[PDB]
Amino acid sequence: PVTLARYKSFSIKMLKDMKEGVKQYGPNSPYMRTLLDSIAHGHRLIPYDWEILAKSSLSPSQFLQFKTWWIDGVQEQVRRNRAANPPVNIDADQLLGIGQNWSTISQQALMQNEAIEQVRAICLRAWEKIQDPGSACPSFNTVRQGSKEPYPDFVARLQDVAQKSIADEKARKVIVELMAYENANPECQSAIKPLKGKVPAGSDVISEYVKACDGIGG
Amino acid sequence: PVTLARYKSFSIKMLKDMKEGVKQYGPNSPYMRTLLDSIAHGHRLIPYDWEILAKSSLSPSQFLQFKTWWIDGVQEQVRRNRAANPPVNIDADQLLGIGQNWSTISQQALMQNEAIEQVRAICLRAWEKIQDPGSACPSFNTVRQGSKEPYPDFVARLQDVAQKSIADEKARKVIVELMAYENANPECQSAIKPLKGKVPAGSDVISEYVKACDGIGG
Amino acid sequence: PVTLARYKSFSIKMLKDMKEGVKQYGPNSPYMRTLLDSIAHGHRLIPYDWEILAKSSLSPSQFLQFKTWWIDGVQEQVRRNRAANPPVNIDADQLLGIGQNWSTISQQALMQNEAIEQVRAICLRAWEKIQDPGSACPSFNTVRQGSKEPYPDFVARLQDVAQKSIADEKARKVIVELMAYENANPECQSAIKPLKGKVPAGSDVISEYVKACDGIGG
Amino acid sequence: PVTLARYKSFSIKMLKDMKEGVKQYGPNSPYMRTLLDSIAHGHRLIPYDWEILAKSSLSPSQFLQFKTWWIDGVQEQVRRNRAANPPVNIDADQLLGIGQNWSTISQQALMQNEAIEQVRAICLRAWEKIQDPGSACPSFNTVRQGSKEPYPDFVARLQDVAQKSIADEKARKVIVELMAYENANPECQSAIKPLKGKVPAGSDVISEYVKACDGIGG
Amino acid sequence: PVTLARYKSFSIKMLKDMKEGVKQYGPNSPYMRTLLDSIAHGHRLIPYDWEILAKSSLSPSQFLQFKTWWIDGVQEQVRRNRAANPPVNIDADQLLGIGQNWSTISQQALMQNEAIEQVRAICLRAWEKIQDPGSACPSFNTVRQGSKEPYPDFVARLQDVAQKSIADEKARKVIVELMAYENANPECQSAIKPLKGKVPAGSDVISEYVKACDGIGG
Amino acid sequence: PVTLARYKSFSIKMLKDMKEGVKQYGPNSPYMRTLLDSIAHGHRLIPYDWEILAKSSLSPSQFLQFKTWWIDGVQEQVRRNRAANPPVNIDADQLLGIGQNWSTISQQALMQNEAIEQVRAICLRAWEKIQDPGSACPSFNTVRQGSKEPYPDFVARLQDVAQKSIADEKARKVIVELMAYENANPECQSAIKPLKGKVPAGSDVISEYVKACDGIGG
């Protein structure tokens, strides 16, 4: 990063325990995601650092997948910058680090904050949009609760699989509301009959359910 | 964390152990209970730090419960904040870090002292209210002291559900002993019964209870 | 502790490997006992540090048991201080850290050496007087030696279990002398026939036996 | 340890590895043999330090044997100390740290140089005289070189019992080779026999013994 | 390594992790690929350092292959070195560190800059040309995309054998995509076929290939 | 070692991970051999340091074997120094550290570079000339290749066992050439028919074979 302008390479042990953690819990752990967010906002990065971090971390397949969704995000961001009002004087190759304006490590020491947040958002989104090994064609009406089942651990499996088959943030977050009230057992569904019929403002709909019907055990 | 404002992230070594401890022992070990507030009282945090720390650490089932109770405590707090004398000008989304004025790292570096401790106090209760993924939380009279079982281990199973299900602190310290020998082991209740009301000044009545009950099981 | 007056909190890794060691070998290991003695005499502690150390270490059951025997030791020490010749101007709440003379961390920075050794002896005794999981009603005349059995490893199991069922230091240390000469096999008992009949001074009675009859193998 | 007197304890990290090594290899590995005297010659110790270190580390069966031989060596030492010219004024309980003048940390900070090395020399022999908890120590002619077995491994099984059962150092270096080929493997004794008395100056005769014996087994 | 000449060795901790990583993952993980050149570009090495590092790390089967290709690259390099304009005066055994003038540590401290980078460039290719001890390296048409299998994992199995079997760098970047869909999965080839020649400027054609191929298997 | 003259003892963790590595992979690993070379050339050692390093590392059997081949190397080096032209004014006891010229640690601080390289070569050779547990009488015409066998992993087992039964460097390195061409399967032997009949200069004969016939897989 930069302090007051030079480059400082990372300490070696960070790559070691990062490789350890991704090897143990996959590239889409909730653990390593916020680890990436912490190391992202905690330092001032250039895209070549993102190249070293990505190539130093995964199998070759996930590395190239990261490269591809990075490329598509570059094109999307460039179209939105040219659609901006007024348009943004930021190209694609400044966002990728190829070309005689941005080839070297010393060239990228003099970027600006809009590029910082832009590469931050786009590489974070690139990490969010990776698949993983392990495949099964998902059908929503196959998973349901059982007797004496703890309520949040039931809805957690519905929470996690919802971001797989739906790209839109809104489309996945509306159907979990519907699948929550149906796939609940009727004794827990009995608790939501006043809550269903009046959705409250200043509040997440799932958040009201979990702190509503907590006392159903066995 | 802020300092004298730059937001420095945590170390990579700061979080791998934290991810280790939750799978090794759980979310409410006494070890991580005194580990969390050490960081909370040696540093000075913004709500996005907790957004990092919980999402990096919990399970998907636990993290949703954390987010559920986190926004739930805001409703109890903001009613206290609005009717104070003098009334303070702090709204809902200033707590949650959402909205136009609270969703960047540059924004959250510009907050006063009197917001921070409310975030700490609500986050501690949020961290305490998590359920383990083994089961749900049982009721009060669903669990009592077992037969041919030790005494002081089962009375430890009350203070946790007291901190879980009860808000007021001195209510917790008074419900437990008045639930202690009420459906306890009756052979132990013989020794326990003549000790009622024999408390000198400022001591745990449960202390002399387990002092008396030596243990007969095994 | 204090150097020349401030408070310094402990490093985090000490609690980590302490929790590791007690989890591996129990709270009454010979290992962790002298670890407690080393960290006890190696630093200048206040009772609130003992609270953090105890609560940061065990299951809830052992923590409250520690609290109880701590309380009983406070009462015993207070009775002996009032029985002292002349009596000692040291109360109970100075030894416990509750009350407006001794509530805060900064209040306990100005104690004196008699309180230091008093809290040292009494918390050490509190750790010595803990039980553990694992129960069996002990009967002394059930364990005995066998053929080709190594002599010190035979008497070690008699050494360790002797402090369980007897609180008095003298009563447990006299009966092991008797059980040593009887539960030995006659070929090793043959070696002690000059040693039995004249107990030597300046010497422990078991110590003479072990460096007497070492050469009985097989 | 003392310094320029304050008694600073060891680190917590100083002892966990020490507890690791005894269960990992034993009490008289060559590794901990050179580990112990390194601390003993880089620091300056009181007898209560050894009371800490042994009780933190050994088994209950080992610790009693250590305490047994520790007081046993005092009887051989104090006869040498009383009849010296000039006679030194150091008694029994000054060695053991017991009694009114030697049982506090404030007391043991007030000792001269000429006590310390005697404690070190007696403690090294005490640490050497421990028996492993697998069995007892066999006799001399109970063990000899096995048939179809390597040569130089079994001759290593003599120097340990020499240091165990013999006090005088140059007696140990002369008993071993005069016990070496006396009931060794007789086919190897054919090659060994014409090498007697062929030692030039200041070398191990056993060196040329294992030089000659190439190894026939397997 | 040299400095401002004394040859300082590496740390002991520098190499145990390196020995750990090869048995943990292999000789050409991406992790050690970016680990090696970090040392190679943060330090300045002589050929005897690589003699240390490979022999300390590989298997006996791997180390001989490394030594085999290491001397093999010298023949291609020295023909370039002899016919240059101006011709440089560097011979064979100056590369290999053998002979009267290059086989001591005092000798190799006396070399110029323009030798060093050739050693680095040849050693990287030498480290890349190693075969794993599971099997040998297969041919080109022995392996293609499998049936009911993911797409972008199997195309990763081409760039490695490209770097293995091909010397010229831009030949590698052009052989792979012209071998990509040639015996790939034909149902995927239906979507792949209309994308030929649609490359704007300076991008991976394989990127849009795996962009198109979503994945049908499983 | 020495910097500008004192002695500095090693850090304790170096002995720890050295004992770890030799315990895992034996004293004749390719790993630990170059570790010894790195720590050898990386520092300025005295023979007493070699004593501490050797005694701190192995079983007693390997330690005494090291001592013996050390002794024989002293005698060989002394005969060659007296056979030198002019002879070398370096004795045996300067090379061993016994005697009133070389008894102490402070005495060995003032050696010279010929002694440095002499003790380096001779202790390295002492480590090379150790046997190990695990015995089997070797016969060369028992091991051969199979179908689809990877060629370098076949010859690696012939490479490693060749230094066991032959002490001469030339005698073992000539017979592996013969056993290479015979014990190869005829399809790989088919590749060497132009290479057999003209051995190339500036090249190792095995090195040409491995980079000749690499493409025989299956």
Residue numbers in the entry:
A (entry chain A), B (entry chain B), C (entry chain A), D (entry chain B), E (entry chain B), F (entry chain A): 1 to 4, 23 to 236
Give excerpts from the publication.
The largest structure is a T = 3 particle, resolved to 4.3 Å and contains a T = 1 particle within the interior, although no fixed orientation between the shells is apparent. The T = 3 shell is 300 Å in diameter and is comprised of 12 pentamers, each surrounded by five hexamers. Hexamers are located at icosahedral three-fold axes and interact across icosahedral two-fold axes. In the T = 3 particle, there are no inter-pentamer interactions, instead each pentamer is surrounded by five hexamers. The hexamers contact both pentamers and hexamers through the CTD–CTD interactions with three alternating CArec protomers linking to T = 3 pentamers and the other three linking to T = 3 hexamers. These non-equivalent contacts are accommodated by relative shifts of adjacent CA monomers reducing the hexamer to three-fold symmetry, consistent with its location at the icosahedral three-fold axis. When the CTD–CTD interaction is with a pentamer, the intra-hexamer CTD–NTD interaction has the same structural conformation and specific hydrogen bonding arrangement as the T = 1 pentamer conformation. By contrast, when the CTD–CTD interaction is with a hexamer, the CTD shifts away from its NTD by 3.6 Å, the R143-mediated α6–α7 interaction is lost and the intra-hexamer CTD–NTD interaction has a structural conformation and hydrogen-bonding configuration that is comparable to that of the D6 hexamer. Measurements of the radial distance of the centroid for T = 3 pentamers and hexamers show that pentamers are situated at a higher radius than hexamers, 143.9 and 136.5 Å, respectively. This difference in displacement is accommodated in T = 3 hexamers by the alternating shift-up of the CTDs (3.3 Å) to interact with adjacent pentamers and shift-down (3.3 Å) to interact with adjacent hexamers.
CA forms the capsid shell surrounding the viral core that protects and transports the viral genome and also interacts with host cell factors that are necessary for trafficking, nuclear entry and proviral integration. Further, we assemble particles from HML2 CArec in vitro and use single-particle cryogenic electron microscopy (cryo-EM) to determine the high-resolution structures of four different types of Fullerene shell assemblies. Our studies of HML2 CArec show that an ERV retains the ability to form capsid assemblies using the same architecture as exogenous viruses. Analysis of the shell structures reveals the intra- and inter-molecular interactions that drives CA assembly into pentamers and hexamers and their association into shells that encapsidate the retroviral genome.
